[PDB]
Amino acid sequence: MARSYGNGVYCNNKKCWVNRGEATQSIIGGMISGWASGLAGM
Amino acid sequence: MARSYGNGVYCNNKKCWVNRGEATQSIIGGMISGWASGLAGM
Amino acid sequence: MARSYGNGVYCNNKKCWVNRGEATQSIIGGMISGWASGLAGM
Amino acid sequence: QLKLTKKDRISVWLRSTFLQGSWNYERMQNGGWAYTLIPALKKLYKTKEDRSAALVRHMEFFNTHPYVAAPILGVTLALEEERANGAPIDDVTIQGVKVGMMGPLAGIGDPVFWFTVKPIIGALAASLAMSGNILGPIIYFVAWNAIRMAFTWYTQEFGYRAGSKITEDLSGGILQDITKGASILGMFILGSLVNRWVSVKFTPTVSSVKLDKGAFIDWDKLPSGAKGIQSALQQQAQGLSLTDHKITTLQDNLDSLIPGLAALGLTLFCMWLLKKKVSPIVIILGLFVVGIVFHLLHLM
Amino acid sequence: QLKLTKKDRISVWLRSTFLQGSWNYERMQNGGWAYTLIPALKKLYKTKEDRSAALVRHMEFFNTHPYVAAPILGVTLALEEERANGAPIDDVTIQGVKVGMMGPLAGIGDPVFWFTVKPIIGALAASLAMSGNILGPIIYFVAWNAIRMAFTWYTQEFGYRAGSKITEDLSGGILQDITKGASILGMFILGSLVNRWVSVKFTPTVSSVKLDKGAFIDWDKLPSGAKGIQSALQQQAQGLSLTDHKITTLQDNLDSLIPGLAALGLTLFCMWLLKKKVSPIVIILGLFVVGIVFHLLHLM
Amino acid sequence: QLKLTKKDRISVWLRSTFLQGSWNYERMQNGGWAYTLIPALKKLYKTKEDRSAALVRHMEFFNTHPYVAAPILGVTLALEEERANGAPIDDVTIQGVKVGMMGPLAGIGDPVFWFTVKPIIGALAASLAMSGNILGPIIYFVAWNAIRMAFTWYTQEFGYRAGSKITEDLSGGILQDITKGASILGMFILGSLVNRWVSVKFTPTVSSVKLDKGAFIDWDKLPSGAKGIQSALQQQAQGLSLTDHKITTLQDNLDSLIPGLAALGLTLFCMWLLKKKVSPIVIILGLFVVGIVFHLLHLM
Amino acid sequence: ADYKKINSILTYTSTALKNPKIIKDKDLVVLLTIIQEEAKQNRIFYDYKRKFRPAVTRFTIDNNFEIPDCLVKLLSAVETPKAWSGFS
Amino acid sequence: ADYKKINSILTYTSTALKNPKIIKDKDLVVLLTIIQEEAKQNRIFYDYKRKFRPAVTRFTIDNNFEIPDCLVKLLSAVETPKAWSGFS
Amino acid sequence: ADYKKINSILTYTSTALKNPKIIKDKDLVVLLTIIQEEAKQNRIFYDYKRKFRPAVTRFTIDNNFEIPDCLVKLLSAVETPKAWSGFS
Amino acid sequence: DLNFIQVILVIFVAFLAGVEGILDQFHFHQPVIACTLIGLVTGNLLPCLILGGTLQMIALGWANVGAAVAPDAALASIASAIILVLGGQGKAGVTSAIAIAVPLAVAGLLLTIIVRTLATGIVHIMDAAAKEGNFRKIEMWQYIAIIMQGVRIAIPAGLILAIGAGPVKEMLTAMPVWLTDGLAIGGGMVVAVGYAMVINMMATKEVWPFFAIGFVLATISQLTLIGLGAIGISLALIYLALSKQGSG
Amino acid sequence: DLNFIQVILVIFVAFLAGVEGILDQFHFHQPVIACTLIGLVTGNLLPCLILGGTLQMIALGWANVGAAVAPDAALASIASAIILVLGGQGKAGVTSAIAIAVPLAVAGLLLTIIVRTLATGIVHIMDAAAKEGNFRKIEMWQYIAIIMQGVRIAIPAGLILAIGAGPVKEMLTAMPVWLTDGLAIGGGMVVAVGYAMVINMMATKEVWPFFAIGFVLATISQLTLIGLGAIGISLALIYLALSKQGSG
Amino acid sequence: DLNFIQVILVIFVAFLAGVEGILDQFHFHQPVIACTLIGLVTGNLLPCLILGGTLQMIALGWANVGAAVAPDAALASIASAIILVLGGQGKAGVTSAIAIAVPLAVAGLLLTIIVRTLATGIVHIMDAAAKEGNFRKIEMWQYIAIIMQGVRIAIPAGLILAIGAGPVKEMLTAMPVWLTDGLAIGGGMVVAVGYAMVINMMATKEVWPFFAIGFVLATISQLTLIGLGAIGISLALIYLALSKQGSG
Ligand SMILES: OC[C@H]1O[C@H](O)[C@@H](O)[C@@H](O)[C@@H]1O
């Protein structure tokens, strides 16, 4: 009933909302992996 | 009311059956330890 | 409604009692901390 | 003699916004880099051979994060101003200082600006914007641009004022430790994300066996009033079921081995596919159609 | 000269079924190994002393997994045919190639066939049989035997066609790595099985303190109808006790220390007892009686 | 000649209870140490210069756990008896053996007596005392005093009889390894205790979003009798919120990052302030007042 | 592929392998030998593991932030996949 | 323990300790000293840790898969507990 | 603080830094140098990390359980925080 | 409807997002800024604003790294927000358009690479400009390589406006439910491609075991991403200290 | 009842299970097979097949390793099947026989070792047979040395058929509840012996810490056995690479 | 009320508690022993025993380490017991006395530190006695220091008994809820200072990673503290075994 679109926002059939918890984890998870991979790239 | 007999089969007072999940986990642990048992032996 | 005074005893407004599990955890953690600190301090 | 003024440094600042202007794949940012250098090289050299010598030089392979190139831009302008007035610099130090800087400044630039600063600012603007707030976009354009022009301008002056006397003290004794330690975190943290952030779930059910007496609650003998709920929580607390059927799905069968097992298989398969010279646009276009078909066949 | 035909190789293969025929503890599979070699040695050596020399030779200590003995069987047949026709081999290579092969091939045979292949076939075949299905036992005999005869026959011919040119490249640089890495996993994985697969569960209760007000759900003031359940889960969710008594059993007191504490003692005690020259049939028979007593006194 | 009788040893025993009599911070336990040795210094030396030499010698810095000083007491008594009877011991072996013994015995005594046996005896006595049994304090005093007196007397006798032949086999090649393993274990366990025993919890609420249909159970359409509880439990198990409002507290916002984040922050701040020469009495009083205020401001 | 590219890559790789300083970078030699070998077959090496460019910086920093002509002209001899998806 | 077995084991291990090749494997030299002593005490060694047999393979493989007579005749000197329970 | 204490600490650190056996102890050399420096500035060193006394024990044990006069008289030259809270 | 001032005004923003989609400097192609500009110039402001807020969340982590190009948020924002205005359904159609932004985000990824490949021809022309030392010749052609990236988004926008509200509402009503549902499922699998190319750049026999532990430790749901990273740093700190002592 | 055609056929199947119980080649001793043949000849087929399916699960991991002997599934299968046939209660008596199949599986462990010890003397006869070069004296005894392994199973079966259907029904009704209940509890304590033998062969001061972590890591229910294995190998891979640096 | 025999006995018990606070030999200063003695001499025995058990549970881990000294359980116990007897409310004032103990414990810590700082003059007079070689002055001044450490707690007890039951009952009834609540919360934050001090004594660049691992592993609530210690020992042993190879 709720199609996942990532970063805390899935959708509904008439309204889409962002989940703060999943938004906060995505804001952090990308930071950790982005920093490491960017460093491992050099 | 149900006495454990291992590998997913316990029993009842008139009929015994299999727990598939614990049957699956039994094969996994036997596989992993058995591989190392022969290997560490040699 | 219950004020944590640590080591298992919190209180109430007319009665104070010890949580035995928390007393056990505190005694074991104190044992570990004292042993490690005494061993490292030397 | 051929000193570079404050004015020409600002024109170099304005043109650096186009540092990604051409962006071919052969030499990525040569056009934007060479375009940025014209206001200096116009005055630095005046012969046709000398103007040709500079333009052939800076057309070579250059690529980095466009904000972190300003310290390169300062040191490059430091070298050519010294070169124009007389200094034995010839095609080895001009490229060498640049190439020593494009790589490592990108790997410190890509995390800071792309994957850390942008999402942190982006979330604030989005959270406001989703709430019908016009102040969302206005903050985002202000925040990102105020941050950007301060760093891109100030450090460009710093690269010019410090010469190439900051690149000598950049020995790679630390650098061979930083990337290697980075890989440990990365392979670790991507491991955790693979188990989590790769959405692969299977719907279809396998077995729907029928439970015996003593397994399910059997909502027929429950007491009526202030004691029916009592026995409902305690029987569930002992492991009794809310229906007389145990529903088992393929996801549990995979999950019984390890969680995220189907995500790893896709993750390994993508690893295998890229090594096999498959353009990721085909794989991702394929990865969308797979979601179309597997959902149609009631699989995902 | 003294060549061995296809037919004689088959009887050696047919005879290897009895490779465990004698199974004395002094020499484990010598009788079955020596019996397996009769059709070859009869066709190889004709003198009485030569037959005695071969028979004293192969009565010595031999043991491995009876399926992976065929590559040894072929290499043994490779050496004997070379030896019978004239080759300076003197009782040092004959036992040497065998003893170099019995050990390490068991450590690969025992996992592959005993603890991996046999139960995967067995668990699949049992699942049918428990359902009253005659397809179960028939498949199991077919599955295990079809796997067996091809493997034990094919590798017998490979050992003969490859001789002592396989063990030469079997150096101990790798062998030391495998077992030590095996021991890290083994001590790890037996650690996890010990915490789980060893059932030492204690029944008796210790403390039954009577809870005060605000601790339990108090099923007297609960609302009646479409609001009784709501406050039941909310009182449940905040930790209020489903009954007016808190029961603390012996298993809780050990579990509050660490899970699986009673299981670690037993296996270590079995470790200690087995070190103390106690034959495990005494330990296991004693363990069964312990279960009889500790259940009688309501301990387990 | 100047042999020490049993009476003087018993007097040293009785005087050792006051080993912490002075307890200044400059020289820690020199007062009680020198007081315990007054009978020895009386009975050993009789000249005015020699008594002054011994007293000046034994007013120097001494500290350890007061119970485990008895082996030091014995070795010191043996060394001084040798010094009195004639032996080239000159202010270097007295102090040397003393200071060699102070450290490791304190590090082995602080765990055994303070943080291992004292709290268990105290917990037993406290449970007994709160249970209304007067036997608690009686058992506590009896047990602790018996343990102390037996340990002190026996250890003093051993230290006297053993001479300085125990510390010679006390090379420092292994105390480094013990200390390093101790530091690893202690840092791990102190991280765990920081996360689990320091409670810094915030009360105030942040977000109270109003949920749509299908999110909460909506106790209006629930069935009446022997099926309402069923549907309530199924909707609870599927994750439907038990109320039409979702409560998000600042503690949840911090916990979404990592549990114990505020506790780690306070731990870091205490480390930093102690490094910055702040007397821990001031820090603890300030912590009490901080708790007072933050509870007044409805924060904690 | 393009015949003017392959020959010049074979020129620059053959030039790079004789400079005394590049051979010291044994890691760089592996890249050049494969790059020359692929160019020896009219194919352009596929750098899906983006290793060549980080190494050219590692060697350059190891050589007092100085670079020759052959390494610079070979920087455009690589493919370096170009279809990012992100971290999300 | 049999009296003909004890003397034979004391015979075989004795000749094992004098071969140059068996001496080099220090793992086996520690083993064989144990084999003599309990044979010297009229008892048959109880290696609940199955160490002796794997070492014979370890030594044999190190000697180009060659074995002498003394190690082979000692293969039956072990007890090797025999009441398996399984892994379940 | 105390001027006599500062002068005596300076003297004792000075004579400690001239004994060969103490000179060998680099870990103790660090503490002695730092303590002499702080005495040179008329302050009494504060060690929230109780490092000096365990180090004097380490050195004494490394010197056949023998100690000189300067380390003994400097044993009282440290602050060593005194407001324990416990482990609880 | 859209009058002649608006139909051109949407083109001006549409070209600039393509202009800014490669420049990455003033960030007009971001969903929160791009969607906001289309809604402002068309009169349907708030529905475009919230879509911009909604889409900016999905497009948080899209950033070009090296030669890799992010899923072209310039097309996903500009072209999706136009269908939001033409198709009607201001606040009701925030959901409808968002569903087709991601496939459009992919569709831009195809077009950016085709443009980024034609930019190879210009530098081949531009290399000649280096052979004669012309400062004018390089400037003019650079404006071309900058203009072409803008029309890379204005051309798709031209057809979506050429295909007016008539057929646009028909397509948003003739949408099967499953075409929506499976596209969302495919969207949550695409991140497996990005990880693999990142893992391929970092995986070695030394660090493969660190992947397995982190994968398995992700199965304990009480741990957070920060906590998993803290475990990630600590093994890296321990491994390096243990390896330098061993090697020297 | 059992006729004379069955009693011969019953013992022979039991004899072959003993014959195959040591050969470990054609797998007639397995519970799915061995139970099935007893049910086929006695007419009570399906109850035996279900028992064979049930018992195979308890005996999935029983395999001889080196000198160690598995708990003799040949006796447990034969004795339970005859218990199930003689005493009646086809499907109702599936549980009752299974309860006594495990203890008799141990009873064969006693019997198999006594047999495997008398098999020493035959080879002592056989050693002199090598001293004369007698091929036939070698073959004859090996057939003999196989026969008593079948006899070890056919003799209890001969006594179990000697004790006819009368007393076997009496004992199966005279089984106390606790005699059943305690035996299962003892059954789940057996694997402490098997682990102890394996841990003794593998435990060293260098690998004891790896035991403790694996024990402690087993206390998190979200980890499965496979996940715990991946963690174990990852330390094993890391430990090998780290110790090779230090040693060389 | 309290008569002259009772007040003298109370005062001497308080003095002995003050002596044992630093003597740490007979441990009269413990809450159970001290509260028991005070209740016995005041006639209100059982409330004092219960209170002492409660504080002993509170004060299990208070032990002076090195120069660091615990918050003086002797004064806390003595003052709580005297509050409990004078204020009335035998079993009702248990909670109030327990609440008042902790700040009183901190006050006793301050008093004992002041006394230990004043003891330097005594140590200097003993240095002079060593310079003149007098045993008697040493004994006299040691007795004198023991006497002041006893009076360190006999004095607050004397002043509290000087303040009659009236005002102490008034102060017990005039206690705002928030004062006690915030005091409990502040007491629940104290152990941060001690943990920080121990870490400062232990923290190095080689051990901060292990701190992080342990801290993050503490978030899995199924793991017990014994299990966490086992994990810590295992990591320590693996690290030492690897680093010993690293050194050579
Ligand atoms: O540090 C060890 C030792 O130090 C000081 O002397 C006192 O706090 C003792 O109680 C403690 O045992």
Distances, alpha carbon L101 to alpha carbons C17, D104, J185, L91, in Å: 16, 60, 62, 16
Contact B34 E114 (CB under 8 A): yes
> Exposed e or buried b for every residue in L159-196, given b needs 16+ CB within 10 A?
ebbeeeeeebbeebeeeeeeebbbbbbbbbbbbbbbbb
Ligand 1 pocket: which of L64, L72, L112, L198 to mutate (most atoms within 8 A of CB): L64
Q: Is the separation of the CB atoms in F292 and L179 below 8 Å?
A: yes
Q: What is the 3-state secondary structure (H, E, C) of chain G?
A: CCHHHHHHHHHHHHHHCCCHHHHHCHHHHHHHHHHHHHHCCCCCCCCCCCCHHHHHHHHHHHCCCCCCHHHHHCCCCCCCCCCCCCCC
Q: Is the separation of the CB atoms in D238 and E247 below 8 Å?
A: no
Distance, C-alpha D136 to centroid of its chain: 23
Domain ranges of chain I: 3-74
Q: Is the separation of the CB atoms in J227 and F258 below 8 Å?
A: yes
Query: Looking at residue D259, what DSSP letter applies?
Result: T
Distance CA G42, CA F159 (A): 87
Distance CA K186, CA E285 (A): 9
Residues contacting D117, CB < 8 A, separation 6+: D144, D147
Q: Is the separation of the CB atoms in D14 and J121 below 8 Å?
A: no
Q: How distant is the Cα of C33 from the closest Cα of chain I, in angstroms?
A: 7
**Of chain C residues 17-36, which have a CB less than 8 A from chain L?**
18, 23, 25-30, 32-34
Distance CA K245, CA K229 (A): 25
Those chains having 3 or more beta-carbon pairs within 8 angstroms of chain G are: A, D, J
Q: How distant is the Cα of J95 from the closest Cα of chain F, in angstroms?
A: 16
Beta strand pairing call for E205-207 and D248-249: unpaired
Element (H, E) at E249: strand E248-249
Distance CA L190, CA D218 (A): 52
Distance CA K123, CA K142 (A): 9
Distance F26 CA to ligand 1 centre (A): 14
For chain B, the straight-line distance linking the first and the last C-alpha, in angstroms and rounded, comes to 44
Specify if L196 maps to a domain.
no
Distance C32 CA to ligand 1 centre (A): 18
Q: Is the separation of the CB atoms in E242 and E216 below 8 Å?
A: yes
Distance CA K21, CA K36 (A): 16
Distance CA E59, CA E21 (A): 13
Q: What is the 3-state secondary structure (H, E, C) of D196-213?
A: HHCCCCCCCEEECCECCC
Residues contacting H57, CB < 8 A, separation 6+: B42, E99, E100, E102, E103, E104
Question: Among candidates J113, J159, J147, J170, which has minimal Cα distance to J10?
Answer: J159
Q: Is the separation of the CB atoms in E186 and B41 below 8 Å?
A: no
Residues contacting H45, CB < 8 A, separation 6+: H34, H35, H38, H39, H52, H77, H78, H79
Domain boundary among L190, L211, L231: L190
Q: Is the separation of the CB atoms in H81 and E274 below 8 Å?
A: yes
Query: Looking at residue D248, what DSSP letter applies?
Result: E
Domain ranges of chain C: 1-42
As given in the structure block, the two tokens for residue E284 are: 């296991």
Atom index in ligand 1 nearest the CA of residue L69 equals 8
Contact J123 D31 (CB under 8 A): yes
Q: What is the 3-state secondary structure (H, E, C) of chain F?
A: CCCCCHHHHHHHHHHHHHCCCCCCCCCCCHHHHHHHCHHHHHHHCCCHHHHHHHHHHHCCCCCCCCCCCHHHHHHHHHHHHHHHHCCCCCCCHHHHHHHHHHHHHHHHHHHHHHHHHHHHHHHHHHHHHHCCCCHHHHHHHHHHHHHHHHHHHHHHHHHHHHCCCCCCCCCCCCHHHHHHHHHHHHHHHHHHHHHHHCCCCCCCEEECCECCCCCECCCCCCCCCCCHHHHHHHHHHCCCECCCECCEEHHHHHHHHCCCHHHHHHHHHHHHHHHCCCCHHHHHHHHHHHHHHHHHCCCC
Distance CA D262, CA D258 (A): 9
Domain ranges of chain D: 6-170, 183-208+249-300, 210-246
Resolution of the experimental structure, in angstroms: 2.2
Distance CA K108, CA K70 (A): 10
Report the residue from D207, D212, D256 with minimal CB separation from B24. D256
Element (H, E) at E248: strand E248-249
Atom index in ligand 1 nearest the CA of residue F106 equals 2
Question: Among candidates E63, E178, B6, E117, which has minimal Cα distance to H82?
Answer: E63
Distance CA J78, CA J158 (A): 11
Chain position carrying tokens 């943080």: F115
Chain position carrying tokens 């399926």: E67
Q: How many CB atoms lie within 10 A of CB H23?
A: 13
Distance CA K185, CA K177 (A): 13
Q: How distant is the Cα of K114 from the closest Cα of chain B, in angstroms?
A: 26
Radius of gyration from C-alpha coordinates of chain E? 31
Chain position carrying tokens 């454990």: B4
Specify if L197 maps to a domain.
no
Q: Are residues J16 and J119 in the same domain?
A: yes
Q: Is the separation of the CB atoms in J56 and J138 below 8 Å?
A: no
Residue B42, SS3 per DSSP = coil
Query: Looking at residue L204, what DSSP letter applies?
Result: -
As given in the structure block, the two tokens for residue K176 are: 């106390």
Say how many CB pairs under 8 Å bridge C and F.
Answer: 77
Strand partners, C18: C9
Distance CA F36, CA F34 (A): 5
For chain F, the straight-line distance linking the first and the last C-alpha, in angstroms and rounded, comes to 72
What length is written for chain E?
300
Question: Among candidates F1, F29, F36, F4, which has minimal Cα distance to L135?
Answer: F36
> If you write DSSP's letter for every residue of H38-59 in order, what string do you get?
HHHTT-----SS--HHHHHHHH
Question: Among candidates J2, J100, J94, which has minimal Cα distance to J49?
Answer: J94
Question: Among candidates D111, D193, D251, which has minimal Cα distance to J223?
Answer: D193
Distance CA K11, CA L140 (A): 100
Q: Is the separation of the CB atoms in J58 and J87 below 8 Å?
A: no
By what method was this entry solved?
Answer: cryo-EM
Residue D23, SS3 per DSSP = coil
As given in the structure block, the two tokens for residue F250 are: 């600042």
Question: Among candidates J108, J187, J188, which has minimal Cα distance to J152?
Answer: J108
The residue segments making up the domain with residue J218 are 203-247
Identify residue L54 by its one-letter amino acid code: T
Residue D176, SS3 per DSSP = helix
Q: Check contact A-C (3+ Cβ pairs < 8 Å).
A: no
As given in the structure block, the two tokens for residue B10 are: 């316990």
Q: Is the separation of the CB atoms in J87 and J172 below 8 Å?
A: yes
Distance CA F164, CA F169 (A): 10
Distance CA G8, CA G14 (A): 10
Contact C5 L181 (CB under 8 A): no
Distance CA D156, CA D234 (A): 70
Q: Is the separation of the CB atoms in E13 and E152 below 8 Å?
A: yes
> What are the DSSP E strand ranges found in L32-174?
none
Question: Among candidates J119, J126, J40, J111, which has minimal Cα distance to J75?
Answer: J111
Residues contacting K18, CB < 8 A, separation 6+: K29, K74, K75, K78, K149, K150, K151, K152, K153, K154
Radius of gyration from C-alpha coordinates of chain B? 14
Helices (H), ranges, chain E: 6-15, 30-36, 38-44, 48-58, 70-84, 93-109, 118-130, 135-162, 172-197, 228-237, 250-257, 261-275, 280-296
Measured in degrees and rounded to the nearest 5, phi and psi for residue K221 equal: -65, -20
Residue K68, SS3 per DSSP = strand
Question: Among candidates B41, E49, D255, F91, which has minimal Cα distance to I66?
Answer: F91
Residues contacting G57, CB < 8 A, separation 6+: A42, D99, D100, D102, D103, D104
As given in the structure block, the two tokens for residue B18 are: 């299999």
Q: CA quadruple F17, F18, F24, F30: dihedral positive or negative? A: negative
Q: Is the separation of the CB atoms in K228 and K211 below 8 Å?
A: no
As given in the structure block, the two tokens for residue F263 are: 């506790």
Beta strand pairing call for E248-249 and E205-207: antiparallel
What length is written for chain F?
300
What length is written for chain L?
248
For chain C, the straight-line distance linking the first and the last C-alpha, in angstroms and rounded, comes to 44
Q: How many CB atoms lie within 10 A of CB D164?
A: 19
Question: How many domains in chain L?
Answer: 2
| Minimal-distance CA residue to ligand 1 atom 12 | F65
Query: Looking at residue I76, what DSSP letter applies?
Result: T
Measured in degrees and rounded to the nearest 5, phi and psi for residue E25 equal: -75, -20
Q: How many CB atoms lie within 10 A of CB H79?
A: 15
Pocket of ligand 1 (CB under 6 A): F 28-29, 63, 65, 106, 110; L 24, 64-66
Cβ-based burial of D149 (10 A; exposed 0-12, middle 13-18, buried ≥19): middle
Q: How many CB atoms lie within 10 A of CB B16?
A: 22
Q: G87 contacts in A (CB within 8 Å)?
A: 29-30, 33-34
Distance CA G87, CA D150 (A): 28
Q: Is the separation of the CB atoms in J198 and J61 below 8 Å?
A: no
Distance CA C27, CA F123 (A): 9
Question: Among candidates H27, H25, H8, H7, which has minimal Cα distance to H72?
Answer: H8
Q: Are residues L124 and L155 in the same domain?
A: yes
Q: Are residues K230 and K131 in the same domain?
A: no
> What are the DSSP E strand ranges found in K5-117?
none
Measured in degrees and rounded to the nearest 5, phi and psi for residue A18 equal: -105, 135
Distance CA F137, CA L36 (A): 7
Count Cα atoms within 13 angstroms, Cβ side, for F291. Answer: 25
Ligand 1 pocket: which of F65, F112, F118 to mutate (most atoms within 8 A of CB): F65
Q: How distant is the Cα of L73 from the closest Cα of chain C, in angstroms?
A: 15
H64 Ramachandran zone, left/alpha/beta (phi>0; psi -120 to 50): left
Identify residue K57 by its one-letter amino acid code: M
With residues binned 3-state (H G I as helix, E B as strand, rest as coil), the percentages for chain A, rounded to 5, are: 50, 5, 45
Distance CA J160, CA J168 (A): 8
Residues contacting K96, CB < 8 A, separation 6+: K83, K87, K89, K172, K175
> If you write DSSP's letter for every residue of E185-239 in order, what string do you get?
HHHHHHHHHHHHHS------EEE-PBP-TTTB--TTS--SSSSHHHHHHHHHHTT
